[PDB]
Amino acid sequence: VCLFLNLANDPTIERIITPRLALTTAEFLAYQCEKHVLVILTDMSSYAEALREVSAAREEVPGRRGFPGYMYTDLATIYERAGRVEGRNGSITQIPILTMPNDDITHPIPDLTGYITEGQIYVDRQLHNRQIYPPINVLPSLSRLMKSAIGEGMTRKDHADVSNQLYACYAIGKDVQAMKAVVGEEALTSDDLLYLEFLQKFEKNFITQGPYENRTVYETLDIGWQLLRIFPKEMLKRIPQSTLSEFYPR
Amino acid sequence: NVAGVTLPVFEHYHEGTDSYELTGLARGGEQLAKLKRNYAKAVELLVELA
Incomplete structure (x- = not known):
C-alpha cells in the first residue's frame, strides 16, 4: 500500500500536487518494478474546486458554470496515466470517486469524466435508505470492455452469460413489480411470482455484501447459479442448452 | 374486480319448489320432463352468457 493523505485545512496549492505524486509513484511501481498497481483517487469535485482556486489566482476569466475552460486538459492528463505497455509485465488501473453535485x-465535471473514461458505475440513495449495503444500482451500470476481460481460460467460461441473465431477469422483475403495484395479485401468474422471489432474494443476498465478507468469483458464480435455479430451463432462454447442462442439472 | 375495475356477475339459485310438477298426469309427462331438464340447462347457459 502507498497511502497519501491531505486534510481539508491544508494548503489549496498542495491539493493539486498529491495526485501527480501518486501517479509518479504508481508509474514507477508498475513499470520500473513491473507491478500491477490499482490506484484509487477520491473527491475530484474538490479537486475541481482547487483548480478554480488556482484559476482565480491566475486572473483568468472563468468559463462555464464558473469552472476554468481548461479543466479538460488537466483532467485528461490525470485520467490517461494507465494501461499496459509492450515488453513489460505490469499494468495500472484507475478508479476515481466523483461526488455528483x-x-x-x-454538471460539466461528471459529463467530461464520462466522456474521457470508459463505462461508469452508479450508486443509489434509495438503496442506502433501505439499509442495504453497499447501495449499488446495477440497472444503469455498464462496463465498457467486459467482454474481453472475462471468458474461458481467464475464469469460468459462462460468467458473462450469467451476468446477462441476471440483468435481464432483474429488469423483468422490476417491470412486473411496477405493473403489480397498480394492477394486483389477482391477475398475476406463477412465473411472475418466481420473478418476484428472485428479485427479493437478489437484493437480500447478492447485492448485500457486508463489511468484512471476503468473497471470491467462484462462490459468487455459485450464488448466482442458485438464484437462477429457482426457474426451470423453459424460460432460461438466452443461454444455449449446451452450456446450461454445465450447472442447471445440479 | 380485476385490475382495479369492477364488473357484475350473475349466479343461478335453484329454489326448492315447483308448480307444474305433475301437469298432464293422466296422459303423459315424461316428454314434458325432458323439456324441463333441457330448458333448465338452457337457463343455466343463458344466465352465464348474460
Whole structure:
C-alpha cells in the first residue's frame, strides 16, 4: 500500500500536487518494478474546486458554470496515466470517486469524466435508505470492455452469460413489480411470482455484501447459479442448452 | 374486480319448489320432463352468457 493523505485545512496549492505524486509513484511501481498497481483517487469535485482556486489566482476569466475552460486538459492528463505497455509485465488501473453535485448529470465535471473514461458505475440513495449495503444500482451500470476481460481460460467460461441473465431477469422483475403495484395479485401468474422471489432474494443476498465478507468469483458464480435455479430451463432462454447442462442439472 | 375495475356477475339459485310438477298426469309427462331438464340447462347457459 502507498497511502497519501491531505486534510481539508491544508494548503489549496498542495491539493493539486498529491495526485501527480501518486501517479509518479504508481508509474514507477508498475513499470520500473513491473507491478500491477490499482490506484484509487477520491473527491475530484474538490479537486475541481482547487483548480478554480488556482484559476482565480491566475486572473483568468472563468468559463462555464464558473469552472476554468481548461479543466479538460488537466483532467485528461490525470485520467490517461494507465494501461499496459509492450515488453513489460505490469499494468495500472484507475478508479476515481466523483461526488455528483446534487444529482446533476448535466454538471460539466461528471459529463467530461464520462466522456474521457470508459463505462461508469452508479450508486443509489434509495438503496442506502433501505439499509442495504453497499447501495449499488446495477440497472444503469455498464462496463465498457467486459467482454474481453472475462471468458474461458481467464475464469469460468459462462460468467458473462450469467451476468446477462441476471440483468435481464432483474429488469423483468422490476417491470412486473411496477405493473403489480397498480394492477394486483389477482391477475398475476406463477412465473411472475418466481420473478418476484428472485428479485427479493437478489437484493437480500447478492447485492448485500457486508463489511468484512471476503468473497471470491467462484462462490459468487455459485450464488448466482442458485438464484437462477429457482426457474426451470423453459424460460432460461438466452443461454444455449449446451452450456446450461454445465450447472442447471445440479 | 380485476385490475382495479369492477364488473357484475350473475349466479343461478335453484329454489326448492315447483308448480307444474305433475301437469298432464293422466296422459303423459315424461316428454314434458325432458323439456324441463333441457330448458333448465338452457337457463343455466343463458344466465352465464348474460
